[PDB]
Amino acid sequence: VSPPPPIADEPLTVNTGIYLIECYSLDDKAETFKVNAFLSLSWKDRRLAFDPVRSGVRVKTYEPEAIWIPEIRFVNVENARDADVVDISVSPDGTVQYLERFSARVLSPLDFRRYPFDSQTLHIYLIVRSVDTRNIVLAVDLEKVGKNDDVFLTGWDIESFTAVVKPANFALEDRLESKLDYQLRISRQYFSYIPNIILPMLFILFISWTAFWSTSYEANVTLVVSTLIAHIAFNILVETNLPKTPYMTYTGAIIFMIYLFYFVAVIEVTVQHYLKVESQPARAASITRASRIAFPVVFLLANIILAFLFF
Amino acid sequence: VSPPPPIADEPLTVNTGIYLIECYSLDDKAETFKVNAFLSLSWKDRRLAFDPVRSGVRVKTYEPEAIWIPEIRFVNVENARDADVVDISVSPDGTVQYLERFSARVLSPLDFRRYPFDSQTLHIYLIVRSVDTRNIVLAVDLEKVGKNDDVFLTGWDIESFTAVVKPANFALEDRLESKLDYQLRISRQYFSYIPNIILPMLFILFISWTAFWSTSYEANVTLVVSTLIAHIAFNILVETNLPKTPYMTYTGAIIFMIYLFYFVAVIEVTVQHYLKVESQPARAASITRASRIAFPVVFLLANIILAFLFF
Amino acid sequence: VSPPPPIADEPLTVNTGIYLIECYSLDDKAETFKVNAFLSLSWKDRRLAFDPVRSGVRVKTYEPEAIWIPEIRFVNVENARDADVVDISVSPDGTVQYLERFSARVLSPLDFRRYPFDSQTLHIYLIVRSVDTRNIVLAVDLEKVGKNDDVFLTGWDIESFTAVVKPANFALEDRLESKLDYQLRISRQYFSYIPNIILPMLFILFISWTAFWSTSYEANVTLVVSTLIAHIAFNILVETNLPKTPYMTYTGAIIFMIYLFYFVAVIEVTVQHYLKVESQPARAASITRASRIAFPVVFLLANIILAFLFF
Amino acid sequence: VSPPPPIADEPLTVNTGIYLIECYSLDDKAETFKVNAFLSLSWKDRRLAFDPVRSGVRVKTYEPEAIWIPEIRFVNVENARDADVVDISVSPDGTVQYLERFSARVLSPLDFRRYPFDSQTLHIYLIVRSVDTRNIVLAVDLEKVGKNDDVFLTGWDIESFTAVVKPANFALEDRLESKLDYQLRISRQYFSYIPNIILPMLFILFISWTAFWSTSYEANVTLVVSTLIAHIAFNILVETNLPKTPYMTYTGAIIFMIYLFYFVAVIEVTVQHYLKVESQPARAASITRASRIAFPVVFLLANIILAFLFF
Amino acid sequence: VSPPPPIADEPLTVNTGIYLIECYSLDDKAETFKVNAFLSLSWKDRRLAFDPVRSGVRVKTYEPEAIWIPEIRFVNVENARDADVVDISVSPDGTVQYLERFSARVLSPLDFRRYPFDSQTLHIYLIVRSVDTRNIVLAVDLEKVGKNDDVFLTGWDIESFTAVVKPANFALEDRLESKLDYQLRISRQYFSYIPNIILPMLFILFISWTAFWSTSYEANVTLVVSTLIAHIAFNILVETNLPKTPYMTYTGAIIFMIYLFYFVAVIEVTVQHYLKVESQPARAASITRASRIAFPVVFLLANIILAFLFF
């Protein structure tokens, strides 16, 4: 067992195909996903040619160890894939048709900029390193790239599973490597973030704003501080489900902006009380009256500015 | 070792049967469960037939490697099942009776719409891909589908373990695939949600409503805000034990609706105080008196509307 | 290698023995425990008998693959046990003495009714399936059932490790199955629950009762609500360390009952203030005075009733 | 391959040695640690003895399967160790020098009594079970017991890695067993507990004591209750990182004692207010004045008593 | 298969090189990281040399088992690396060129002193133990040390992957051990700590300082205590994501220092009220006025002192 030799001096083409069966565990924090799929491989090995007449059988079946099989590996995996050889069929000409079912944890970075309204392009990079006797090249057999209809990935929508037909051939450690890019396009199902995080966060903020219709400092201090604590809780909850990004996320921006609102409202509440004690409730009253409009207006404007910057 | 050949040109029938031994780890968030069961396979291989009289042995036992065994795989699994071959028995007519005990982590989506009063149909999909020499078809031997009496799945009730007799036969990557659907029907034991989540959540809400029998703004602000924080806690606790759904759940709806109640009660408490400071306690008094009835009534009506929509 | 044939037509007795080495990870939520023990198997295989004299050896040693060894499996395990064959000894009469050291994750349900003052009976079910040529039966060699003195199971006391001598024989998928029940009797070390959960929970409740010696509504609302939140925290902490039971637990009952106390105390606090505002502090004063005795009395009575029902 | 036979009727001495390479994951809750070390085994097998002059070679090499190797196992492990045979060298007299590198998860109970100022003695128990032909005995080759300089165990100090030279020889299931005790002495790096848990816990308690310099019941109720909630948080945080002990820990004692302080302070704060409302501020004033001294004094005395009992 | 013998009496040089493919899971608490890379080994084995003319091939391919391959191990790993042999090529002069792709969990301590503004040097220690026939020594083939462009480590910046050319040779259990140090230089992406932890922590502290512009003790007690609770939350959140260090961290210092600020502010708040009740608001007023400047000034100075000490 060693590579099939060239007729002329051409490189060996291994036709590939990935057919998704299962998609699960898209971990945001880890930027990983688990995949269970069929990996199909085809190449001509003339050494394996046979006469169906002389051997009875139209197609021969081989055990992995019996024949030369190309060393196909995934680039962006945690550990080497768990594979089970489903079948190895050889036609009389020596054309090998290899099928395996595999499972792997794929490392694919995510762009959290538009979270939870983001979409992603997951990658599965197939690779072959060239042997000494001959160069091995990868190719996509589009007939063998797909996914089953039941492929669901919890809390995401699957747009497309396609392969970039042209491999990336390059040198690595004094040998040629032929790499293919399989692309899984998905979009996050943002629905649940609305009643679980967005609306509750807004409600608590709006409740803080009731202090603009109160002259009671002690009640205001309670209203603003208490809701700020509930906001910290939401911030912590949100940040625990996301990885630490070197960029500002849409969600991150909003969450942060809201802190400034609580801070300014505390200042207002402090100012209003200070003036009242200092026997000038007229100034205080006009500040409070302005705030009642300013706060919602500035909040609504700021959000428009943000959504614009982010989308 | 290669498939047994057809007498005429009929497909090979593999008689299947799953007998559950253990059911555990139904993870709601992951939408997975662990299973430990017997997998029974039975097909005819004439090449294995023998004389009952001349052999003197009623049945013959083989080692997996000695004979051709169909490649049965599960569709909705995380990784390929962990199997141990228990026994392989061949009768004189060449009927093969294979038995293995396996363990696997099954991927089966759940409908959270009626949580925690929901019922589910877990699936275990058995599959076989046809070979070049012949088409392999799956069949259910109802005599070999079951579960042991002790099979308990913590916090769930096991209604039935049945198999859809008619396999789904279809082409996949230029070969035939025979797929069977094993169904585990279960219903959630909702009992514990009542004293742990439902009642405490109602209690805290009812406690907020005591502010309708108080003229103290500062005490009211404390009553409503404090309980709202306890509600956020329950919401977080509930949402951490559930996956992110693209649909509204019964629980989710209730939890959300309750936020509106806390918000409106804050408005009322603000309104009542505002009118008191503005020297008109008569208007305030009639608003508070109305609220005392409105709040429970609207709450009770809203819940009826919801339960109707959901059940 | 195939089963030893019967002298008459008797079944094959496999003498068993489990000797515990390690006991760890009793997971309450999962209702599992890990075990590391010796498994001893002994049966007669005449085909291996020898003359001690012409051999010049009292005992013969074998490698697993060399001889027929019964397929013993555990019923209530997550995955098939991890075993290492320690030693296989053959006496002149063909008596085989097999020893292996194994590790396994055992599924054994727990009765949470008396938690944290509960005791449990963990099970380890040994099984063997009968073959075509003969019926394989299990037996307990009491000389080979035990545990080492150092076997400790964190936060539990080990009472006894015994085996039910008479195996449960039954047909499962047209073959007789012989099952043995090994029983590990344990009792929970309740000590720590007293200073960590019980007493703190009582302290916070008693602190709520100080509102019966206060006329300040605003301070009372703070006392009762604040402690109720600390109670919710204890409830959450307790419920996270336990599985969801379809029955009421002793702890569960107490925890729940206490909610009613906080609810009623809120009502009292509301009533007392309402009467004070309504210019009738005499009625309020006698209600508060009654509560001061009622609350502790009813609490103490309720607990007596509960402990009775549960123990 | 079978044991080397005795010259006289002496037992087989297997000289052992453990050389630590890595120490990690000391889990307090689990009472486990992970270890990566060299395991060295040496014994005389005369059958292997050769001539140094004629053979030309002064040392002869073997593959595990080629020769008899004693079955050494660890007692206090979760699962059987992961080992890689490094080398097997045989000297002219038949002395075998076996070396393997292994990794294992060790089960070793901890004494939480002095936490976080505790020290521990971790154990690694080596064992050998005697065979039918001969008795196997373990011995410590002190030249082969050690640890590398870089062996660090996060948040612990490594004092010593020594072996108790005299093995524990005893009967187990009608055979002899020889057991060695390897001891890893460590002491907890308590530093971080001071600014993260100790001081914050004291600060919140001292803040509660400011109510002894306040006549405002409503402010006092807030001071004492709020800090008690922060104490419950610290208690929960501390108890989640420790296993459930049947004994009282130093930390446990302090944490609990502090609850009594919050309870008594609540009583004081209630008493002071009650007397004030009852128009006798002189009695109240002298109670508060006494408390100002009593509380710190009793706290300081109680801690001295505790530290004494525990250290 | 045994080591290539020395021409003179020189040690065997094994030329190494690690080429990183994947970098993930830098766990701060565990002080571990996962790595997926190519391991390249090259040594001369003259017993394998050949004439390119007679053989008619300029290279020779071998299966691992066919030839002698040095036992290279990693020092700082949890368990032995998961490796797949990619290729083994022999040149005419008997120069062996080995390549494997491996995955491992590396134990590399981190210096938390400057967190979250820290940089780290991760280590990968390659080792070889010399055999009886000869001494093995490791060397770096700089042409074969690298990383691919896509190598990203979430929340960290990869500065350099270099190897210390000169191995650390030493005696370990009477044999020579040659050790190489591969160094991965990284710097933490501190960005996210600013809007998620730093700023919110400052905001809550600044909000506490509004009590210096209030005469309301009850409102002040609420402001300072409530924010102190939010600070405890941040402290807990921060400490859960870090290991327990025997040294003070920059973050740790700040977090702790801030507690003193809350404590002193409580004292001030208590003093101011005490003076007011004692009918001397003039002294109280000047203390409060001083605090308004003192607090921010001392805070700003203290931070300057700290940043200096730490950077």
Ligand SMILES: FC(F)O[C@@H](F)C(F)(F)F
């Ligand atoms: F700010 C919101 F739009 O985004 C967040 F708050 C999140 F994550 F969705 F909860």
Ligand SMILES: FC(F)O[C@@H](F)C(F)(F)F
């Ligand atoms: F019924 C709703 F309130 O949902 C809650 F009860 C739940 F989910 F069960 F905890």
Ligand SMILES: FC(F)O[C@@H](F)C(F)(F)F
């Ligand atoms: F109810 C009592 F038994 O105590 C419980 F609440 C406990 F111990 F926390 F589980």
Ligand SMILES: FC(F)O[C@@H](F)C(F)(F)F
């Ligand atoms: F009480 C002291 F021993 O410290 C404890 F509170 C601790 F370390 F925080 F757990």
Ligand SMILES: FC(F)O[C@@H](F)C(F)(F)F
């Ligand atoms: F405050 C600085 F010390 O850094 C802190 F904010 C941190 F690490 F982010 F928690």
